[PDB]
Design a protein around this ligand. Structure first.
Ligand SMILES: [Mg+2]
Ligand SMILES: [Mg+2]
Ligand SMILES: [Mg+2]
Ligand SMILES: [Mg+2]
Ligand SMILES: [Mg+2]
Ligand SMILES: [Mg+2]
Ligand SMILES: [Mg+2]
Ligand SMILES: [Mg+2]
Ligand SMILES: [Mg+2]
Ligand SMILES: [Mg+2]
Ligand SMILES: [Zn+2]
Ligand SMILES: [Zn+2]
Lengths: 114, 135, 91, 69
RNA sequence: CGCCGUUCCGAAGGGACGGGCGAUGGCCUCCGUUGCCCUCAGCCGAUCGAAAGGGAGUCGGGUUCAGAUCCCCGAAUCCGGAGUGGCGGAGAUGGGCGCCGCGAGGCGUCCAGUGCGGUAACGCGACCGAUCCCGGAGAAGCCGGCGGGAGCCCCGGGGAGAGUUCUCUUUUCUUUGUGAAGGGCAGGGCGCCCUGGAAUGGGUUCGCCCCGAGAGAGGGGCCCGUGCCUUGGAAAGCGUCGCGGUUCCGGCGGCGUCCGGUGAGCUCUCGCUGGCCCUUGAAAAUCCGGGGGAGAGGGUGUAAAUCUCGCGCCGGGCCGUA
RNA sequence: AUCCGUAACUUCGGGAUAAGGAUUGGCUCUAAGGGCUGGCAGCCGACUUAGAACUGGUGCGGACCAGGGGAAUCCGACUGU
């Protein structure tokens, strides 16, 4: 059967020399050089193990030529924080701020009672 | 007892408006055939009025006090009830669940809430409702 | 079926290293590979990541612990010592 | 290459200043109208022979036309 | 001669949005440039260091005595640039009141308009915004098992040519295309969403493993799609039979380039899940998102600022290559 | 390679392919082990395992590939250099 040869001078099986077979219109198998596999962004929460959704998994310099819609999500922090943790932050912000008002009134009250 | 009633201020927890403040215009605790879950029609602030100081002119202040509103139907699980209640009278003949069929009615519904929100804002009542939540 | 009489998990070492050393390392080998119940979520998923680092796959929490056990006896005692001294510090 | 679905947008593409020529290819099942613009080779695939002749006669004047065999 | 030293005994920034002053220009309208002043600035170490590390973007066919992913034919793409950098689209053409008309609609005012849809995951072709801040990618070991996709091999048939035919062999051999980029769709994956509330516990893998911190069951969203179709593209290539020519022509014609199956198979690759560590398995360049809201833009229009949208315009120097 | 069998000693992991036997070709059959569709019916299948008869001048892992074994003593634990 037909045996393949590299089409470039890099003769080693390094991470930047990976290939795939491809049958051409001339009816022969050649090597095509694959691009590296991209990664979707990781959440900014540093906790959720999964990657973000609604975003292209591409190499970092390819992000320059993509429109903005492909790189984010139509929501606060979209493309940077997962929805699950944005829910927790909205509550956490609101609930801690409420707690401040409560303590402020009690602290003011004891001052009045003092 | 039940507290999700009209005039109740809620924080939106999900969607394009996550983190915004809204006010319940109509609550449906049981649901319907279209929405089996419990939901509420809310009218909230997409874009809050900007901070104004005494160092700005009348014109700069007017420019900075405009509010962009929105009207939505929300699953209760995506709302965060708050103790604050805000009583702006929102015309229910224009702001109702039916505005979701044709965009022309929704524009009136959003325009209505824009005017009503802006008139209340200037009076200095319900200051919390018109301050963006920093989260 | 019971496959070994006494070696247990140190049966991987075969005949090598001596009975007493193999017996000794057996206690640590079992413990450093056990899944401890997580105090923060309750699911038995707490597992050793490196020496001294314990991680829970459910709530994703990480805890600095003993080399071979989730918490050492020395540390457990000190936590009660520090708790006690705190009160007298402010009565 | 781009594939065009409607005649209307093919005619417009032929009227662009950067359209150089139109290649008319006849197959057994369809007639393909390919126009070479600056960036893409747009193609219109026509399954009706009669519509093809009507189109070939209504291309903008001055566009080089080549029939392919 | 010099050596040590690399942030350590250093006044180590020559930059900038914007603001104020002058001087010059030109499509002298108003915009630019240039000099000064005000304001803002951690990076904190010059420089070198890899033809196997990181690092945008090119593939198919033809062609030579010797070169081709480089030449030619064709089809793409990245980067940078143009604001005299062009066109389209988006921003963006709404509402109330008063007349005019039967209305379709036209006038006059007063207001709005830095886009929109989905309960959600998230979606839509764009969809303003600086200093500042946060985050992501680049950017992560070794081994095991399992799964998907290819290439190859294998099996049953149609073709075309060839071989054997003393006898036998519906026989044996050869060959039987479709690139990058774009679109569509399979397939794989999800620690994504919504309903709901589960013990007589159930679901589930080769192993596991999963669940009131939400399982089963429904209905959805997203990522990769190297697989198939499509534009490419049959025009090309190949197989074969037949004619031509200068005959050293990318010569011209006819037909064909077909249909199924199968696998712990081998090779590569994508993915899920595990085990080992007193071993935890680069950095930087470079690119991106987010938070914030300093500003900017126009007063209802020949609308403006603005646009990561679709087209269009210009260019990519040096060195190696037998 | 299949089936059987296997001691001293032992740090219970080993020793161990311990040791020791039997079998093995060709040919013709039998049985079991699945998917798709609509306790049944039809259609597709991929290599295996096991048993039986017959058979050759007892030859059959027919070439190739492919551990001799046991009882002890000394030294060094082992793997590594
Ligand atoms: Mg390299
Ligand atoms: Mg292909
Ligand atoms: Mg997106
Ligand atoms: Mg290099
Ligand atoms: Mg479920
Ligand atoms: Mg042909
Ligand atoms: Mg913002
Ligand atoms: Mg060469
Ligand atoms: Mg022995
Ligand atoms: Mg030795
Ligand atoms: Zn998170
Ligand atoms: Zn836990």
């Amino acid at each position: 059967v037909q045996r393949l040869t590299y089409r470039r001078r890099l003769s080693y099986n390094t991470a930047s020399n990976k290939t795939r077979l491809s049958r051409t219109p001339g009816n022969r198998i050649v090597y095509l050089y694959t691009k590296k596999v991209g990664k979707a962004p990781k959440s900014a929460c540093g906790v959720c193990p999964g990657r973000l959704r609604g975003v292209r998994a591409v190499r970092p310099k390819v992000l320059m030529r993509l429109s903005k819609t492909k790189k984010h999500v139509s929501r606060a922090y979209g493309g940077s924080m997962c929805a699950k943790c944005v829910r927790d932050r909205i509550k956490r912000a609101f609930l801690i701020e409420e707690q401040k008002i409560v303590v402020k009134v009690l602290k003011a009250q004891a001052q009045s009672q003092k | 007892g039940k507290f999700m009633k009209p005039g109740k201020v809620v924080l939106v927890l999900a969607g394009r408006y996550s983190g915004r403040k809204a006010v319940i215009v109509k609550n449906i605790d049981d649901g319907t055939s279209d929405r089996p879950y419990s939901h509420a029609l809310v009218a909230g602030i997409d874009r809050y009025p900007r901070k104004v100081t005494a160092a700005m002119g009348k014109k700069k202040i007017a420019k900075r006090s405009k509010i962009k509103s929105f009207v939505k139907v929300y699953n209760y699980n995506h709302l965060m009830p708050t103790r604050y209640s805000v009583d702006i009278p929102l015309d229910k003949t224009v702001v109702n669940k039916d505005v979701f069929r044709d965009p022309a009615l929704k524009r009136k519904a959003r325009r209505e809430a824009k005017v009503k929100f802006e008139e209340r804002y200037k009076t200095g009542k319900n200051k919390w409702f018109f301050q963006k939540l920093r989260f | 079926a019971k496959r070994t009489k006494k070696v247990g998990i140190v049966g991987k070492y075969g005949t090598r290293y001596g009975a007493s050393l193999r017996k000794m390392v057996k206690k640590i080998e079992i413990s450093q590979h056990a899944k401890y119940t997580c105090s923060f979520c309750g699911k038995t998923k707490m597992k050793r990541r490196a020496v001294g680092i314990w991680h829970c796959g459910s709530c994703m929490k990480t805890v600095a612990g003993g080399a071979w056990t989730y918490n050492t006896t020395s540390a457990v005692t000190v936590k009660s010592a520090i708790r006690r001294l705190k009160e007298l510090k402010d009565q | 290459p781009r594939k065009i679905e409607e005649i209307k947008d093919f005619l417009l593409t032929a009227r662009r200043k950067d359209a150089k020529s139109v290649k008319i290819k006849k197959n057994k099942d369809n007639v393909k109208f390919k126009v070479r613009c600056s960036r893409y080779l747009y193609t219109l695939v026509i399954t009706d022979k009669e519509k093809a002749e009507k189109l070939k006669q209504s291309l903008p004047p001055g566009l080089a036309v080549k029939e392919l065999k």
